[PDB]
Design a protein around this ligand. Structure first.
Ligand SMILES: [Zn+2]
Ligand SMILES: [Zn+2]
Lengths: 47, 46
């Protein structure tokens, strides 16, 4: 089954590029933190 | 479990190993590689 967390990562990564494309660099830097946090949890071990 | 996903997972593991060993320059380099590879992997491409 698809991870909703993986989709959340894809979405925030896309959002970061979209925000950058509008010059919203302060929002970008906060979203980068969120992206890194979501990846940190996604790449933890289940077992 | 795909090869490019596993690669990112493993870099992430190595980041935490390097942090636990206080290797700041190693961490910085690994983070750079992780972010580059993340970009390519998680972008939804044509
Ligand atoms: Zn982490
Ligand atoms: Zn990117």
């Amino acid at each position: 089954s698809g991870s909703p967390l993986a989709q959340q990562i894809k979405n925030i990564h896309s959002f970061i590029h979209q925000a950058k494309a509008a010059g919203r660099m302060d929002e970008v830097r906060t979203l980068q933190e969120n992206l890194h946090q979501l990846m940190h949890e996604y790449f933890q071990q289940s077992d």
